[PDB]
Design a protein around this nucleic acid. Structure first.
Length: 535
DNA sequence: GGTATGAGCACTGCTTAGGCAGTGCTCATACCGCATG
């Protein structure tokens, strides 16, 4: 399929940077079989992709190589980083996103050999015949753990296979899935023939990366929030009884239920008439909102609870009317209204402030290159509250929030990049980030990472810890409320080990795609050629 | 329920034109959630 016999004699490996065994072995593996590469962040998933893409570029000179990333900033970062490693002239490559008109993309597809794009552009260009589907010989998928359900990654492969089976897939993920079931879906969706995995624990990784120790700070909930929690549980009980009596909700202890368990109960209901549907849907929507509020109170604090409730109690939803007829709700809501110096709406926030102050004290005492602190909380109200709390210490602490595009106005792609550049240059020394700061964009190495919340899935914890590494031995602090939050953390670490074992096990836990094309003709055994690549 | 993201089209400012290059909007994805190999 257009394979260049002469180029097939060799596979070229860059020596610009010292050769690492794990990068040499994994690169070679990925040439001959569809591979999912799982390395810690900063240990060279991008380098391996560049090596693979450059050799496919050489081996299929009339073919195309495609690199997919989930965000526009990541596309730009990755084309730049891969350009530096590969021996491909700038004129043979292009970035393509929704910022390039579909009309222009057709000309870029035809004139370029390597394309870095968002997967939605690829889906659109395949369906509309702008992408010459048959000419694709290599497809690199970054953040490949996102290749679940009908995500654009899954759509690209399903559409491409209509036109050609003769391409290599390289998937890159530090965190292949939340569990085995998710890892199996990624393998199935992306036609993965094998996994090449190294952990922080891996000896061949320890050489090129400082081990980083996790500190846990357990914070008791305290009298004030305990008392509000106790009032909240009774409000929860009164609004959930209808679902207990309707038998749509199992009846499992009201205080121990989660918003996720009720969204599932609602979903199981929506697949099993008239006035009835309206009242049940209404009861479910009220309970899911209250249990959201309950989670905010336990994990984020009273200010987060208030702001969420204010969004509801600000139009006439049924939720607004019902909750408005409850005196305990309106008592609590009116109390939070009054409440909102700086108010410490969760004991975790006071503990977070102590840790950050002590870090800057200890750093400035050692007197000169500014320290960098990244704090992760999932909710926008928490991130703004944490930022306001730490703003009291300006300009010793120079805090900025890092949030997604949706409006608390939200940040555009351009505004996000300015905050990152400000963080890198020490304009800001402290970043408070939602999940947008966990994935892809090279923020830089950070001296202190703080996790304000915890999830049962291990993915986001590993991503958050990825923002510190070798260059400078970093510190990872995890602030947990005592009880549940401590168990969620213990579960995420157990789930991480479970996935590692399953991937590494001699027994076939995972079902790999067995029909990955060799791509190099069966006659040709390409020989390693190490060289200094010059542009 | 909130958190990201995306594309394509709307809208508007430019120093000098263009589907430029920005932000805004509507419509899609996905996750979270049992616990293990």
């Amino acid at each position: 399929g257009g394979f260049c016999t002469s180029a097939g004699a060799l596979w070229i490996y860059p020596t610009n940077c010292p050769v690492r065994d794990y990068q040499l072995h994994i690169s070679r593996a990925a040439l001959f079989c569809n591979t999912l590469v799982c390395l810690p962040t900063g240990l060279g998933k991008t380098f391996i992709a560049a090596v693979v893409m450059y050799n496919f570029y050489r081996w299929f000179p009339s073919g195309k190589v495609v690199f997919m990333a989930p965000t526009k900033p990541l596309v730009t970062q990755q084309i730049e980083a891969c350009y530096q490693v590969m021996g491909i002239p700038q004129s043979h490559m292009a970035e393509m996103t929704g910022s390039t008109q579909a009309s222009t993309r057709k000309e870029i597809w035809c004139s370029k050999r390597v394309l870095f794009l968002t997967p939605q552009v690829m889906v659109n260009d395949l369906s509309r015949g702008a992408c010459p589907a048959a000419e694709i010989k290599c497809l690199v998928i970054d953040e490949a753990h996102k290749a679940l359900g009908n995500y654009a990654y899954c759509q690209v492969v399903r559409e491409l296979v209509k036109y050609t089976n003769h391409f290599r897939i390289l998937a890159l993920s530090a965190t292949p899935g939340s569990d085995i079931k998710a890892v199996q879906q990624v393998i199935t969706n992306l036609l993965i023939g094998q996994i090449e995995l190294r952990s922080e624990d891996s000896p061949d990784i320890l050489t090129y990366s400082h081990e980083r120790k996790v500190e846990k700070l357990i914070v008791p909930l305290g009298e004030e929030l305990a008392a509000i929690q106790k009032t909240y549980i009774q409000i929860l009980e009164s609004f959930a009884r209808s679902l207990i009596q309707r038998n749509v909700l199992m009846r499992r202890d009201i205080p121990n239920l989660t918003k996720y368990q009720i969204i599932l109960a609602r979903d199981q209901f929506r697949k099993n008439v008239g006035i009835q549907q309206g009242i049940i849907e209404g009861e479910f929507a009220i309970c899911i909102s209250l249990y959201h509020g309950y989670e905010l109170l336990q994990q984020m604090g009273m200010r987060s609870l208030y702001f969420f409730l204010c969004g509801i109690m600000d139009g006439m939803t049924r939720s607004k009317n019902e909750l408005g007829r409850n005196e305990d709700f309106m008592k609590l809501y009116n109390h939070l209204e009054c409440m909102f110096k700086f108010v410490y709406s969760h004991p975790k926030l006071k503990k977070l402030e102590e840790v950050v102050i002590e870090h800057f004290k200890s750093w400035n005492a050692e007197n000169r290159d500014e320290t960098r602190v990244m704090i992760f909380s999932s909710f926008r109200d928490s991130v703004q509250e944490i930022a306001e709390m730490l703003s009291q210490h300006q300009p010793i602490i120079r805090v900025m929030t890092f949030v997604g595009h949706a409006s608390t106005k939200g940040f555009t792609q351009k505004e996000q990049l300015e905050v990152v550049k400000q963080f890198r240059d020490g304009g800001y020394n402290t970043l408070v980030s939602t999940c947008v700061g966990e994935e892809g964009l090279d923020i830089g190495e950070v001296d202190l990472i703080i996790c304000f919340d915890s999830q049962k899935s291990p993915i986001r914890l590993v991503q958050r810890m990825g923002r510190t590494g070798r260059k400078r031995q970093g510190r990872i602090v995890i602030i947990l409320s005592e009880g549940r939050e401590e168990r969620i953390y213990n579960q995420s670490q157990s789930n991480k080990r479970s996935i590692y074992k399953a991937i590494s096990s001699n027994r076939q836990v995972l079902h790999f795609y067995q029909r990955s094309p060799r791509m190099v003709p069966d006659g040709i055994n390409p020989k390693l050629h190490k060289m200094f690549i010059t542009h």
